[PDB]
Symmetry: D2
Subunit: 255 residues, 4 copies
């Protein structure tokens, strides 16, 4: 029988990695309910970042902050579900998923999002930096939250996720203030762009938009976008600062 | 300075492999041109199976049949291009690509030369090896490039012995009784309308466009014929083709 | 920060795989005690081949023959312990381990080795063939049993392991009868080689021999070697057929 | 035709990584010569860190600092050669190799040019990345080629800023108080005999031969000095070297 030849020829230029997206999640369960759920349940993730001040995190034997690998990076974890981004879908296929332990909650009708611990965030920066250096096609726009890829079925990582902080650590996409201001200028002078240009702009950035956009959808689109890039207010309303941030991101990060 | 914990917890049930498809191509070029084009060129493939009776090949240092890895399975080779199968698309993300050296020609009309016996044996060994390590790589998921890029591609063509691979436990094929049963029914009931036919092709796995031309429909049939009714792949609708399709769908309801 | 470049240059000739050895084990426990032991215990293996006629194999939910992956091939399973072969040691590092469910037993003072099921053996041939095609440096002599690499602390895969069958499937090292006979001829004419040549021969084949070989060691060396290559009798005694098989293997598979 | 079951059971506690060592080398050649020698030559390495102020480099197409992967971490690069550390040997099996472009020279006497600042930053980033994914790659396990092939190799040499990497959380280094404490003791008690010294080197990790020459002992000291007392690596026994060693052993009793 034949032994495969791995030495005589190797591809150099025309190839890549399978993974190009990095997705952030909150668990909305305490540590113990999270591991169980993400290992033996109906969903998994590549990494689970626990919150050290979690009574069942201590109850399980743990002390300080750590990072847990649940599925190997080369394998498909089930974390994204039905999703889209940058003209791809079924994002489980092409992504690594990070789950963060956080008691975000819950649809009591009302969404309530608690802070993240600091050790968690320092872990997340270390982790994602480790990953990005190893996957050349996960460019800034491709570090996303579950809510960007599943508008608006999901609401993680949430408005407590310090995206700009991550960006300053070289993790993810953020705009330049000068550029944002100029678009704002800007829209306050000749007015907000037609909804057509906006939809186009959102698609352009990465959002997987339906063929026709509901008023309720558009709300959820803005909300998701604001929860990520304009978290001071994410009521889902089209103001000029929102439109400005979008346009600035597109300018900074085009095709 | 945390270290990652790979020991405390390990997902069992809810996870899988990123790869679930296996795509077969022909190179349309000799060995020397293929290895160059798939290693430094515009495209690539996970594996290359050379044709031993090739001066390029012998000249390169080789004699007997072998199997070359060019891209590690875990990486993304550039072989599917714009493509779709089984409700997925961009099949480069989730497939493994096999290139077989074979001098297929598109002048204005296609000449498809036979594959060497040793190539088929190598292919059979390589596919079994892969099929055993990718649980969701079910039989309908071993496809030709022409199955996933309909009308754009004609590889691996009609000389690829699909039935032979099926007998080796590689890829989908129909039961003879089931086909005859369907052809019997269509013969006395008439063929289904295009609309239902198309649905059947979707069902099997083909990535159908929003609307279909006479032209696309032809090339869809031509593609399906090259794989499953190679004795005639003119792209014309006849009862056998439809019967084979319906036969396939019944055996593999996935 | 820098993204690693995986495309500009790729090594072709001067590299290899980390793994080059394939080691066979019996579990000496029923299925249920095996999984538990090899997943949460003090030892693991890359693969676990269950025996389908095992009441707890059925009790766990299983029906027909399958193959279980416990540790990924790229990772280090703990199956070899203190071991040596072909001038390497710490074989856990460079090997893939297959555990076979089999009620081999037990040192009641007496060793008793039951047959393996046939579906198990067909599984093992399929599995090892899959592996060998993917690791170019696991040449025939490098498919070994735990007892070859740990003389004589271990007694698996045991004399019920059909090595010659595996060889005919292209898995592992076996001699040619013509060649064996010639050495036998051979020794019956001018006598068995001095113990020095024999020790040298055994080292040469792959065995990790101590600096000085006890009479009891030499027994265990022969035994292990016979359990693998001359299983009709493995009493640990130096006959001429044993010496002949050794010499033939060395001729067929030299450096 | 079984498929492998990767979902039913997964080992948690009793398993690890095959890699636990990180070895640093210098190329002793410019960029163009290095990439050629490590890709098609007699040796290789997992990663190559180029020196940006190099005509070979700029000529190849590059300008800024970057990091090249040549062999996937999971594979075996050919960089350690005959070697030993921490009771293991053949370190190619269980290590990852990093080559840094640096024009070190052995005429009859060694010239070791400084590393560029950008190279050190890249190295620091690369090592942290690796250290985080290999739990048993403990600080004593980040070694120079000269630590594992004593007397055979002199890389990465005295210009490699080990303390600097230690501060980044990469590799072993001693506590100043602990060293002074040991040097104080040796100064008033006398140095230990060779026999005990050697044991201490073993303890730290060095792979010692059955018997030691004056010659080997010298090159052992020279190796250890290049790493941990670079201000003087003549290979002569003095209290500082011994103190640093004993200081290391106390901090890292692994």
């Amino acid at each position: 029988m034949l032994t495969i030849d791995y030495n005589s020829y190797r591809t150099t230029t025309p190839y890549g990695k399978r993974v190009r997206f990095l997705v952030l999640h909150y668990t909305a369960l305490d540590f113990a309910a999270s591991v169980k759920a993400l290992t033996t349940g109906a969903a998994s993730a590549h990494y689970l970042i626990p919150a050290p001040h979690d009574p069942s995190y201590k109850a399980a034997g743990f002390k300080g902050q750590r990072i847990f690998n649940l599925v190997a990076e080369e394998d498909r974890a089930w974390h994204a579900g039905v999703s889209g981004w940058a003209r791809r879908d079924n994002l489980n296929d092409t992504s690594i998923g990070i789950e963060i332990v956080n008691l975000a909650r819950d649809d009591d009708g009302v969404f309530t999002f608690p802070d993240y611990e600091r050790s968690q965030i320092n872990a997340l920066k270390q982790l994602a930096k480790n990953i990005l250096q190893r996957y050349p096609d996960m460019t800034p726009k491709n570090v996303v939250g579950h809510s960007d890829i599943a508008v608006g079925r999901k609401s993680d990582p949430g408005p407590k996720l310090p995206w700009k902080e991550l960006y300053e650590a070289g993790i993810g996409a953020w705009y330049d203030d000068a550029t944002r201001d100029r678009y704002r200028e800007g829209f306050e002078r000749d007015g907000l762009p037609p909804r057509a240009d906006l939809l186009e702009a959102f698609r352009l950035y990465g959002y997987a938009l339906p063929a026709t956009v509901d008023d309720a959808y558009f709300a959820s689109l803005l909300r998701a976008f604001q929860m990520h890039f304009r978290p001071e207010n994410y009521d889902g309303a089209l103001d000029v600062e929102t439109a400005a941030i979008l346009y600035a991101l597109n300018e900074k990060y085009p095709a």
